[PDB]
């Protein structure tokens, strides 16, 4: 019971930090939808696919 | 130019621009807008690169365009007057920088918003205003001088 | 007149019109009367003829009166146009007729309003109205051409 | 003077005046004030003189002085008339004071707030308003006359 | 008239005038004296009545004489404008209330100080004064409305 709530904590953790730089990924670029994206912060880092 | 203000117990304390397809309020305010149409917007709190959501349907989007690239440093348009500096902002003088003028827009000659001030009060003789803007390739940066309390 | 619009999210989407004592909104749209007096009466459900409750208040009430039967073919003003038929309306050329006119009353020569449009957007050559109407003895009817879209 | 006066279901139910030190409003009639600076004012019950708590910014307040006790018998000027009396109150032609207009201030030539009206719509031939009054020294005191009727 | 403003840093941030017996000089402002014969004046903290010492020999003696009780509430000498009431200061206008122009004096008609200011920086529309008044027989009162920032 100590050992599942390592796991249960740990995980929430770090997809906590992998939603805060999710929300940073797109945020310097959505406020400028005129400006060009890179191939590498879209796929490999980030999500985002090529729109409008 | 159209550009909404925002309304708390009867003055007004800061002002709501709108480019294309998005609609910006600056944090540092709090209160509704004018707009009943901007009202039923979800706008989302963010970073200091100030995101908000523009989400107003299709009759009235494209009121007018963020300005591009390769800026140069001579004149700009100012709804109080005129700033003359690209890397920094111009030191207006005075009248201009005192309290609730949060969020107004700064124009190029062809009407193309640059800029949206957010602070700096007054620094002596010369008032730096800190605003945002994109450096080099659109991406969305945060300038502030020193000292720049929030106007 | 007297016809305040329904407006939902600063939109005008529909119009409610008040008949003697009790006033008539369309319930196929949404949204709330701008009015801060009429906007404090309930609202009770019925059919497609559209009820809502007449709790006006003592300063307001017999503004327009409805026409009994008796009603001739004639010729009756629109707030478009005109409309000249009695077992239906006329059928009103293209263009006329768009998104947003709901109950919009049809008026005779005297002001008497004989009926309320609801539907029949587009009805080939020329738009019929789907309209709630009083019958040959005073009993409220809804007449609908086949194919008439909503508004 | 700038006296906003009550709304209750659009019509005027009655004049809430400000005096400098306690803004007035009669608690007898009923509605909520339209204005946005004076809709922040806390709403605090009183006693029998119908009164509502003053709790003015101090920048917007003293724009209207109040006249002091030991008053002259001579003219005051009322909204649609003039009283001429010390102890009592003069009579008014008749005709004025009907329904929910109370609480407009009785002026002096000089100004300043004498008295604020409360009562007497109809009194016979010689009519006789119960108001509020300075009676010596400056000590608040209603006076009503015999059959007083709320006003 | 006779006053010296304070130096502290090369700009001005106070004024301290002279009364015939006794000079005075802000507390909650800091600097040096701008006389050469005013260097040898003892200089001594003391209570809220801004208390200090005046003792300067008679060669400058007798320069502005005080003022009695019973002032009237009519016109005052101002030196930026003019004051009309006794019990409290009269509602200066915009503009002036600015910073660092504390101690100035408040001349009569008789060119006789009766005041000497020291605060309320701004209040909102109007204006207050924290000035000093003698009551009744000549003794030394500080007066001060609510919310008066130092000035």
Redesign the interface.
């Known amino acids: 019971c100590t050992c599942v709530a390592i796991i249960m904590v740990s995980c929430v953790t770090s997809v906590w930090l992998l939603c805060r730089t999710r929300n940073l990924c797109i945020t310097p670029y959505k406020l400028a939808p005129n400006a060009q994206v890179p191939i590498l912060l879209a796929l490999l880092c980030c999500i985002k696919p090529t729109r409008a | 130019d159209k550009t909404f203000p925002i309304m708390l117990?009867?003055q007004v304390n800061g002002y709501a621009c709108v480019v294309?397809?998005?609609v910006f309020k600056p944090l540092h305010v709090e209160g509704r807008i004018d707009?009943?149409?901007l009202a039923?917007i979800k706008l989302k709190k963010?970073?200091i690169?100030?995101?908000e959501y523009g989400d107003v349907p299709q009759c009235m989007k494209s009121d007018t365009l963020?300005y591009?690239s390769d800026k140069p440093p001579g004149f700009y348009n100012w709804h109080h007057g005129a700033v003359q500096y690209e890397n920094n902002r111009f030191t207006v003088p005075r009248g201009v920088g005192g309290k609730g003028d949060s969020g107004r827009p700064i124009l190029d000659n062809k009407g193309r918003v640059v800029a949206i001030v957010l602070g700096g009060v007054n620094e002596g003789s010369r008032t730096a205003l800190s605003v945002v803007t994109?450096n080099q390739?659109?991406?969305?940066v945060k300038d502030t001088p020193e000292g720049s309390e929030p106007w």
């Open positions: 117990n009867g294309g397809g998005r707009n009943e149409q039923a963010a970073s690169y100030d995101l963020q591009t994109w390739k659109g991406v969305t």
